Design an enzyme around this catalytic site. Structure first.
Site, mmCIF file in Angstrom:
data_model
loop_
_atom_site.group_PDB
_atom_site.id
_atom_site.type_symbol
_atom_site.label_atom_id
_atom_site.label_comp_id
_atom_site.label_asym_id
_atom_site.label_seq_id
_atom_site.Cartn_x
_atom_site.Cartn_y
_atom_site.Cartn_z
ATOM 1 C CG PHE A 182 13.820 37.512 48.397
ATOM 2 C CD1 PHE A 182 12.440 37.123 47.936
ATOM 3 C CD2 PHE A 182 14.823 37.376 48.701
ATOM 4 C CE1 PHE A 182 12.348 35.665 48.718
ATOM 5 C CE2 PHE A 182 14.806 36.253 49.149
ATOM 6 C CZ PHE A 182 13.145 35.124 49.696
ATOM 7 C CE1 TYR B 89 15.988 45.289 40.938
ATOM 8 C CE2 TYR B 89 13.420 45.249 40.777
ATOM 9 C CZ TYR B 89 14.708 45.164 40.089
ATOM 10 O OH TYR B 89 15.096 44.824 38.421
ATOM 11 C CB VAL C 119 9.399 43.691 45.638
ATOM 12 C CG1 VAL C 119 10.545 44.338 44.655
ATOM 13 C CG2 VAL C 119 9.026 45.066 46.560
ATOM 14 C CG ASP C 120 9.697 44.900 39.894
ATOM 15 O OD1 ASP C 120 9.526 43.604 40.256
ATOM 16 O OD2 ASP C 120 10.009 44.595 38.858
ATOM 17 C CG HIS D 275 5.228 35.161 31.589
ATOM 18 N ND1 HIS D 275 6.714 35.241 31.706
ATOM 19 C CD2 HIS D 275 5.213 35.978 30.279
ATOM 20 C CE1 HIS D 275 7.353 35.880 30.617
ATOM 21 N NE2 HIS D 275 6.065 36.955 30.067
ATOM 22 C CD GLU E 2 9.532 33.196 33.435
ATOM 23 O OE1 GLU E 2 9.615 33.428 32.816
ATOM 24 O OE2 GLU E 2 9.281 33.618 34.309
HETATM 25 O O1 LIG Z 1 10.517 34.870 27.963
HETATM 26 C C1 LIG Z 1 10.719 34.586 29.074
HETATM 27 C C2 LIG Z 1 10.974 36.533 29.827
HETATM 28 O O2 LIG Z 1 9.545 37.220 29.354
HETATM 29 C C3 LIG Z 1 10.265 38.436 29.348
HETATM 30 O O3 LIG Z 1 8.406 38.825 29.096
HETATM 31 C C4 LIG Z 1 9.833 38.651 30.494
HETATM 32 O O4 LIG Z 1 10.074 40.475 31.317
HETATM 33 C C5 LIG Z 1 11.385 37.991 31.562
HETATM 34 O O5 LIG Z 1 11.338 38.271 32.441
HETATM 35 C C6 LIG Z 1 10.985 36.847 31.017
HETATM 36 O O6 LIG Z 1 9.929 36.261 32.020
HETATM 37 CL CL LIG Z 2 9.656 32.279 46.814
HETATM 38 HG HG LIG Z 3 9.520 35.318 47.549
#
Ligand SMILES: OC[C@H]1O[C@@H](O)[C@H](O)[C@@H](O)[C@H]1O
Ligand SMILES: [Cl-]
Ligand SMILES: [Hg+2]
Ligand SMILES: [Hg+2]
Ligand SMILES: [Hg+2]
Ligand SMILES: [Hg+2]
Ligand SMILES: [Hg+2]
Ligand SMILES: [Hg+2]
Length: 263
Positions: A60, A65, A130-131, A151, A221
């Site tokens: 997106f 963006y 996208v970034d 993550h 998220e």
């Molecule tokens: O704690 C969750 C957050 O962690 C950061 O590092 C990230 O930039 C955010 O997008 C979110 O994921």
């Molecule tokens: Cl999606």
């Molecule tokens: Hg997507």
């Protein structure tokens, strides 16, 4: 139906010699955790090519963006599913702003201004931000019915430190004694059917939260994490697949930095 693989010459896997001794390569529900060194891409390429696999990559790009599309697409051309059929789906509010990027053979790009289409056009859907830019191989080793990505800021953290939604009033709620990993919302995917099931589940959960006057701490998220907790992914991608070198450097545990944030 899957045809037989052709004769192939490669190093014999060694039963008494682990892939990696520094990281977990399989989850408790027997889903592989994808790290460099755990897979032979030649065998996997053969398996997926024999099935004439088509991968859809959705992104997106709204407002400012759209400026990230050129680098994103150019690097995807060099590192994403090279050799396989790829269909890019760019959702944007500025169709005319999408850059004219040169694509390799068997690759297509569709601009959708802001379904059943996906079910009939691709076998797998990969959803990313996208970034970003590809810096190394991101291939069929990630394909599976449903996958999430670790993550980069929490792969070594205890579940208590995970920034899950902690308020019971939210549908994304996860208590301190629950949780396998903290998945980042910037990179997930799977079969079209599984991805749509996930998006449908999260969409409905968010509507319930909205009606209850609450918004998950980390929005989409937070819901993604609740979904993957209750529906275990069939593969989990290591942080090699979602990194930020300026913020986190290049730790020894990462043999490759494949998909990274753009400063
Ligand atoms: O704690 C969750 C957050 O962690 C950061 O590092 C990230 O930039 C955010 O997008 C979110 O994921
Ligand atoms: Cl999606
Ligand atoms: Hg997507
Ligand atoms: Hg190995
Ligand atoms: Hg998607
Ligand atoms: Hg969800
Ligand atoms: Hg959602
Ligand atoms: Hg989600």
């Amino acid at each position: 139906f899957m045809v037989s693989l052709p004769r192939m010459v490669y190093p014999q896997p060694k039963v008494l010699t682990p892939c990696r001794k520094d990281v977990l390569v399989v989850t408790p529900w027997l889903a592989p955790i994808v790290w460099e060194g755990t897979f032979n891409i030649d065998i996997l390429n053969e398996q997926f090519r024999l099935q004439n696999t088509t991968i859809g990559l959705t992104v997106f790009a709204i407002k400012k963006y759209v400026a990230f599309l050129k680098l994103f697409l150019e690097t995807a051309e060099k590192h994403f599913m090279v050799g396989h059929r790829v269909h890019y789906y760019v959702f944007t509010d500025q169709p005319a702003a999408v850059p004219r990027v040169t694509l390799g053979t068997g690759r297509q790009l569709s601009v959708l201004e802001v379904e059943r289409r996906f079910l009939s056009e691709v076998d797998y859907l990969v959803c990313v931000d996208v970034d970003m830019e590809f810096r190394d191989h991101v291939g069929v080793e990630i394909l599976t019915p449903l996958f999430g990505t670790l993550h980069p800021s929490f792969y070594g953290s205890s579940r208590e430190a995970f920034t899950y939604e902690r308020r019971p009033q939210s549908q994304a709620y996860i208590p301190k004694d629950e949780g396998d990993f903290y998945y980042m919302g910037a990179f997930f995917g799977g079969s079209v059917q599984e991805v749509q099931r996930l998006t449908r589940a999260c969409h409905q959960a968010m509507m319930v939260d909205q009606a209850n006057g609450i918004e998950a701490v980390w929005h989409d998220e937070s819901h993604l994490n609740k979904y993957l907790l209750r529906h275990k992914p069939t593969k989990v991608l290591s942080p090699e697949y979602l990194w930020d070198q300026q913020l986190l450097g290049w730790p020894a545990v990462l043999r490759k930095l494949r998909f990274t944030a753009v400063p």
